[PDB]
Ligand binder design. Structure first.
Ligand code: CL
Ligand code: CL
Ligand code: CL
Ligand code: NA
Ligand code: NA
Ligand code: NA
Ligand code: NA
Length: 148
């Protein structure tokens, strides 16, 4: 009934950023609560857009060996709100599956995606050792800030 380690994830609250402009896009709130020793922060709240998930999947596959990486949601014939809701569902399912794998949970790019608001280029730099702070400090600083 009660597992030793639980990781709960929710993708929620899609929002249009820069609405009406060239740089308009939808992002998604990602909430996480866990007691997993793989994680630095017990709770986190970040926002990520679809192209960032696309990046994340590719990166996970790079390091995953033979552990299969879950597929993302991808024509669509409904309204934009209906498309966004289907996508939101698919992103939630993607992350649930990813979080079942001890191998995928060992990837620091995942942790910075979920528990920091570093940009993709920042995450890449951080895990390549080119940033001024460690993966842990990026995640702790975000936690201790009130940004989520
Ligand atoms: Cl929530
Ligand atoms: Cl971590
Ligand atoms: Cl899949
Ligand atoms: Na969109
Ligand atoms: Na520990
Ligand atoms: Na930081
Ligand atoms: Na701090």
């Amino acid at each position: 009934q009660e597992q030793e380690e639980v990781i709960t994830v929710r993708v929620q609250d899609p929002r249009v950023q820069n609405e009406g402009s060239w740089n308009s896009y939808v992002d998604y709130k990602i909430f996480l609560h866990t007691n997993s020793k793989a994680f630095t922060a017990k709770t986190s709240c970040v926002r990520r857009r679809y192209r960032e998930f696309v990046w994340l999947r590719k990166q996970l596959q790079r390091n995953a060996g033979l552990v299969p990486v879950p597929e993302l949601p991808g024509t669509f014939f409904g309204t934009s709100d209906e498309f966004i809701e289907k996508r939101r569902q698919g992103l939630q399912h993607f992350l649930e599956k990813v979080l079942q794998s001890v191998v995928l949970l060992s990837d620091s790019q995942l942790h910075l995606f979920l528990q920091s608001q570093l940009s993709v280029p920042e995450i890449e730099a951080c895990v390549q050792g080119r940033s001024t702070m460690t993966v842990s400090d990026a995640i702790l600083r975000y936690a201790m800030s009130n940004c989520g």
